[PDB]
């Protein structure tokens, strides 16, 4: 395991918070996972699973065995022509898995290009971008049950996926995800509902656009506009878009005719949290070593030397302010430890 004691977790989280782990272990398969568990329980410690630390807010030194998930394996399980079942291990890095699938002429992941982190973590938060979510192509996964050590498979329904949500995010510390299966496609329609994607693809004038083309466009948009954690510490969009009631949407829109919201099948409005934050006047905010990025209003940043507590308390302040200004509660995306 390359077990390690009293160890900075700085390089293991994208916010670049510097706290220490009682023990840090790397895992490369079920054997190692099972061993880390045993040990964790040997030493009387809780176990904290991490992938690439791209959706993690650490707020304190971690009295626990931290297990960096780093197993490997990407393969075609089964080819059924218009769809192909594929499987990847939890430690596989996400965007390179996407690239893998596209190099095999499989579509369905392109809209999730360049999302950081790991395959293992993807179902926990039901990763989504540009009109697509992991559940849309999800087939099943295999998870270790932390209450008794057994393996279980979850099919799509069992995972109780929702917007930036799953059974696994709902029952924290219960399931350890080992590998993931997705059903990808050939020959289906591209997902181009997001204007900037559609327009940037048009401008390249491909005769017959494919998934690979869509992926290059999305990677380019994301590199252009998104703070890279390796320069400016962050965990991406800090806040989920809030969904409001119809009569509450009605009321907010009376207050604000410029309000940005997207109607749902059930009558509710998905508000744009960037718009809210911006309009509450936080864009580019800065106060000691924390702030909100000047352009991307969802991206909370560590300008350098922030504590996790500082990011937390800034998030809290913004939430509080937006509750008070718009009557809306913004939920966090990152997992808080
Ligand atoms: C610059 C940037 C852009 C981003 N853009 C997007 C985006 O477009 N869409 C989107 O959805 N997200 C986005 N994110 C968030 C993030 O990349 C995803 O949430 C990602 O799935 C987290 O993966 P990770 O491996 O980094 O998870 P970590 O941050 O390592 O872990 C997240 C949570 O999952 C748990 N976990 C991790 N692995 C396992 C496992 N194997 N079994 C059980 N639990 C586990 C951890 O304990 C933790 O609670 C972005 C983040 C950044 C920094
Ligand atoms: N969570 C993260 O860390 C992270 C980081 C980077 C990008 N992203 C995602 O990647 C995509 C691009 O991000 P962005 O920050 O540039 O925002 P964007 O495309 O400028 O869109 C801004 C806001 O409008 C919404 N939106 C735009 N077009 C839409 C449509 N056709 N239908 C429904 N909603 C629409 C987005 O919702 P949605 O967010 O619901 O799409 C978001 O609230 C988004 O889908 C976003 O979720 C996420």
Author numbering: 3 to 339
The study reports:
The resulting UDP-N-acetylglucosamine enolpyruvate (UNAGEP) is reduced by the UNAGEP reductase, MurB, to generate UNAM. All MurB proteins known to date are monomeric flavoenzymes that bind strongly a stoichiometric amount of flavin adenine dinucleotide (FAD). The catalytic cycle can be divided into two half reactions and follows the scheme of a ping-pong bi bi mechanism. Here, we present the crystal structure of NADP+-bound PaMurB, which establishes the co-localization of the NADPH and UNAGEP binding sites and supports a ping pong reaction mechanism with sequential substrate binding.
Crystal form A belongs to the space group C2 with four molecules per asymmetric unit, while crystal form B belongs to P61 with one molecule per asymmetric unit; the solutions are in agreement with solvent content analysis by using Matthews coefficient. The two crystal structures are identical in protein and ligand conformations, except three loops involved in crystal contacts on one side of the protein (β6-β7, β12-α5 and α5-α6) with an overall root-mean-squared difference, rmsd, of 0.8 Å, based on 336 Cα atoms. In the following results and figures are based on crystal form B unless otherwise noted. Ala-83, located on the β6-β7 turn, is a Ramachandran plot outlier in crystal form B with well-defined electron density, possibly because of crystal contacts. In the substrate binding cleft in domain III strong continuous electron density was observed that corresponds well to a bound NADP+ molecule. The nicotinamide amide group is located on the si face of the isoalloxazine ring of FAD, and forms hydrogen bonds with the conserved Ser-239 and Glu-335 residues. The two rings are nearly parallel and juxtaposed together, with the nicotinamide C4n atom in close proximity to the isoalloxazine N5 atom (3.1 Å and 2.8 Å in crystal forms A and B, respectively). This suggests that the nicotinamide group is in a position that favors the first half-reaction. Crystal form B also shows electron density at this position, but refinement suggests that this site is occupied by a water molecule or a metal ion at lower occupancy. Potassium binding apparent in only crystal form A could be due to the five times higher potassium concentration in the crystallization liquor for form A compared to form B crystals.
